[PDB]
Symmetry: C2
Subunit: 514 residues, 2 copies
Amino acid sequence: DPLLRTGSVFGGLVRDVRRRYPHYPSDLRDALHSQCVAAVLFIYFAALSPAITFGGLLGEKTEGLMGVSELIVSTAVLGVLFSLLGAQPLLVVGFSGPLLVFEEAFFKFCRAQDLEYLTGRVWVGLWLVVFVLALVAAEGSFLVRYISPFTQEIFAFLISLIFIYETFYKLYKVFTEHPLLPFYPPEPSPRNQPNTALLSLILMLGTFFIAFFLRKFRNSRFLGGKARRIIGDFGIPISILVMVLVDYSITDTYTQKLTVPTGLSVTSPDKRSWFIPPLGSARPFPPWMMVAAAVPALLVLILIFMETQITALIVSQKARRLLKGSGFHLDLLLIGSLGGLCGLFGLPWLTAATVRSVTHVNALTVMRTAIAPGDKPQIQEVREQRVTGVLIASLVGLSIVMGAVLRRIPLAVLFGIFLYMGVTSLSGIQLSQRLLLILMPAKHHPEQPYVTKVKTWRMHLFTCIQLGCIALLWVVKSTAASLAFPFLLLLTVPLRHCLLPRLFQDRELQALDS
Amino acid sequence: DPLLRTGSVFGGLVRDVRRRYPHYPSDLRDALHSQCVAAVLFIYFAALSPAITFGGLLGEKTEGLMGVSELIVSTAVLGVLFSLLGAQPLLVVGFSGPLLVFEEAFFKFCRAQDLEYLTGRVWVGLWLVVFVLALVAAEGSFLVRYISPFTQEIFAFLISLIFIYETFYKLYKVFTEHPLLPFYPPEPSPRNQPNTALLSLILMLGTFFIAFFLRKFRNSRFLGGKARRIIGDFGIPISILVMVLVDYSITDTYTQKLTVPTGLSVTSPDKRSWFIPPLGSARPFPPWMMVAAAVPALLVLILIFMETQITALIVSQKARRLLKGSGFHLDLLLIGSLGGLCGLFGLPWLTAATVRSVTHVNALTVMRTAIAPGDKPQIQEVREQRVTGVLIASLVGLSIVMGAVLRRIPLAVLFGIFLYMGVTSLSGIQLSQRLLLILMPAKHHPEQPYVTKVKTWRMHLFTCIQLGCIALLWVVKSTAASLAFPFLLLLTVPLRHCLLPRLFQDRELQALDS
């Protein structure tokens, strides 16, 4: 009962510490295996590239005050500290879309009112620290009890679908940068190049298909059991290596490759330094802004709380075989305090990433080797340890000096890897199965509890409502009112607890939503 | 059984006629279905393109005396006549590699000795007619009882493997014609074009994958039974149409498309006409050549007999559920007589095609709709009829006036179709399963009779001998002694009946070889 209220200050934090910390030597010792190396290799690539993309976007939005080096430093430090001290070290922290939206909105507001951006960020971070401390001290993290699988399913489905859409849009942009022309006259990034878009498409599709086939090879009957396990664990590194070697042989064609800043320096050394004074550098900071910085801090608190808590709920489901324990009070305090203290040095705030954390958990799952003939395998265990997260964060931080190795990797392989991640993230959601059941005839449906106890036409209405909510949320995100997206999602909790009981019966709701 | 000897002249032919002809109205009536249209559409494309390729090669070899129009006319006429009068109308006649080798060798011999090529062909055809008549009149087609599944498996495996190899070599040649260059300066088929090789590869792979996925969609549970059957039957036409539309939308890049001669005319109107005089056109024909033309007639007879009878054996296996009957004496007489009479008009000889006939039979197989869950489907029936063969031959003959429609179809789609055909032709051979069983561990082998009654290491030696024979035959085909390939295959019949019993026991041989 981790969500019960105890009635004493900081009770949940003490309970989480006492529950999780004694397992520390086991956490250190569980990392001696060959699967952990493959997980590290996969998640390092899964986590490095979004940092570069969001750093480029952030540098574009904020006129070069924050860029790629700041994001890399923040990711490395926060990931190392969280994996060393967190109660759930399987979460992966990073940047996200809503954080970028908030940063751009706050930059516009600061520019309009003739205020300094970084000092405002400092005061926002201080207020966020105060609010998070006050929330944790009152055991305010027990409201996660009211987040039903309704909201979790909506959130996960929307996030994964958006992930896939952005991957396909990134592929599409190349076909407009390097179009297919009749004539290519002979001649500062290159533009209008031959054989580039088609080669990128081929590399992406090849990486995705090799990864998928190697993953399917695990459950086959060829070769020995040990060889099958070893080859299946290293499927994605093998795909990446094979496609990189294929691309390396063809040297006539231009392909875009990874770029990483060299050296540990701030993006704009002329404008700012590493430490941002809280009282103003060139101008005095007005006290009214110091007092009024609470509202953006409130918005950041709501965003971080929603994202982190929903991700922790999704990761710690009962069907995923999580044993050592979960922390709902310690992780929130760590993330909030570190984010608030990051404001002093001009670094962006971070939150737990849903797809990255789910992929990290999936990479460490060990299935039963005694697969029943013609039966879907069942999870045997999950390797709980802290070494992989620390290693991933350290590699992300250390990538600034490994530019020579990284400049040999094209982006299409990463596109294929992202496509595989997004596709495999959608197979763990009940909404996906209930959505596939629409096409199938009513007599082939499985023996799930929402099929036997619920009429066929009363189960499709639930899916219709969920899809309507997902579409409304996506539409709101796409328009100029995206800053209200974290609030609107929070409005699906009353909907399940105030309006759904008026339509569905209790016995139908208990089996449909569980 | 049709392979017994009766002891009276033309006994087998009379028995075949009396067995098959009464089913004629059923043969006409069984063609009223939607699957027959899909079969016609698939096999028309499967049969048209090899005619064009072999016509080009034949025109290259024989200095324009025989080309594409002659091959098209011969294919159309012989296919129509055979499908109207044959005892097994599911065979598809056409040209093949060994026939091309014999034609080139005979052309070289005629050029060396200063003789006319077409008159020599006329006399060779007359001697072939005489030999085939003498062979049939003595019930000489009872020796097919000695062709064990050993030889049939070797032949089918070699043919399909060569098919796949030629498809991949054609793709490689496409790559070599239009290389990937750094610069493409602007300046008789086009050469050194951009975006051609990669687009051709993409079209081939897309066609193959769409066809495979639509074939797999048949056994799923989505949609109704009628919709599943209809979509599965038309999988290959749908793939072709989709990829043709995809290629048609992109109008910037050059891709090679089907070319077909226009009009019904001989390839070289100056050199020759439609009728070849048997006594010599410009020079008297020496009688010694007339007498001595028997040896090439013997070679042609051996080739046609072997390949046609092995194809008829493969098609009429007991596991394929053939009901109406088979003809081993009527088909040989028809093919031999038509080939011999083709010499007078300067047309090439034809024989049954193994891959084409197997594909035609597969396209007409109806499986049981009551598929057991998690079980391989069982064949329900095969549609026996004469309409599809006549329609395919008529379409092949008529394609000389449909050039406008055909000039919009690229060759990469046909490459993908050929790849699918060659891949699906290898799944009906026991050698394929026994070759896959090498990789699997000894405890996962199925309950086939060659697993229970034969030791594991004594069933791998059989496969090793078969693979050695296949490799030796391929090596012989590749070198300059390819003209002896039909003989060497015929030497595998004594090997199974004189030497294999000295190694294997009767119990092992009876289960390993049917």
